[PDB]
């Protein structure tokens, strides 16, 4: 994902497919871990786009009030993913219904830069611009730890 999000094959030197909702550039992207054909990307226009390789097309797009820096899919729930956002928050989303979030994580005091799931799927870790790392339980909106 750069100016356009491209699909590549190892045995070809030019991009194999061109995916893009429009003209806006793509800042990050993360493949799903269970439904391996589903991909999510983050745009510079404060948007999250969902893709499916089986249809070779984007599927859904939601715009948020601020930019999202990182996305991680739940390794144990194929339809759930968390987003690291610039409004100090990390948001938990369901793929099938993106009009609301499943949860909000609220403890950081600067932009959240990265987020990752534990492979057991019961915890997330967030890194921030405020020089700290926080660990959350997926079911609770405040961190249990700060490093």
């Amino acid at each position: 994902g750069g100016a356009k999000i491209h699909l590549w094959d190892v045995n070809r030197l030019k991009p194999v497919s061109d995916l893009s909702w429009g003209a806006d550039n793509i800042t990050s992207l993360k493949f799903n871990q269970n439904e391996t054909d589903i991909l999510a990307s983050t745009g510079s226009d404060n948007s999250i786009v969902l893709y499916d390789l089986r249809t070779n097309s984007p599927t859904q797009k939601i715009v948020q009030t601020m930019r999202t820096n990182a996305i991680c899919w739940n390794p144990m729930e194929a339809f759930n993913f968390v987003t690291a956002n610039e409004d100090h928050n990390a948001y938990y989303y369901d793929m099938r219904n993106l009009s609301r979030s499943l949860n909000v994580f609220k403890d950081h005091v600067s932009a959240v830069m990265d987020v990752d799931f534990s492979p057991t799927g019961d915890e997330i870790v967030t890194g921030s611009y405020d020089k700290s790392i926080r660990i959350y339980k997926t079911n609770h909106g405040h961190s249990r730890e700060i490093y």
Binding site: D45, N46, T65, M66, R67, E86, D87, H88
Partner: protein, 79 residues
């Protein structure tokens, strides 16, 4: 925290006219119908003059500190 590049439309509506990302007027124009005559006159919302119906010389609005106060009995529509 707010996105300076992509402000909310509600947030911009609260800001001063010159302090928005792209500055433009908060005024507008009206179609004011004369009471006695029913002709339509275009009037500026912040009109500094007592606009008169050309057919009747009938007062339609009165200047104030900001928006002009429309004379009672005069109907209006936003143009």
């Amino acid at each position: 925290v707010q996105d300076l590049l992509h402000p909310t439309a509600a947030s911009e509506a609260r800001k001063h006219k010159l302090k928005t990302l792209v500055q433009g007027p908060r005024s507008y124009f009206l179609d004011v119908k004369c009471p006695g005559c029913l002709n339509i006159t275009t009037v500026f919302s912040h009109a500094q003059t007592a606009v008169t119906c050309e057919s009747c010389s009938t007062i339609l609005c009165t200047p104030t500190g900001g928006k002009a106060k429309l004379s009672e009995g005069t109907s209006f529509r936003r143009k």
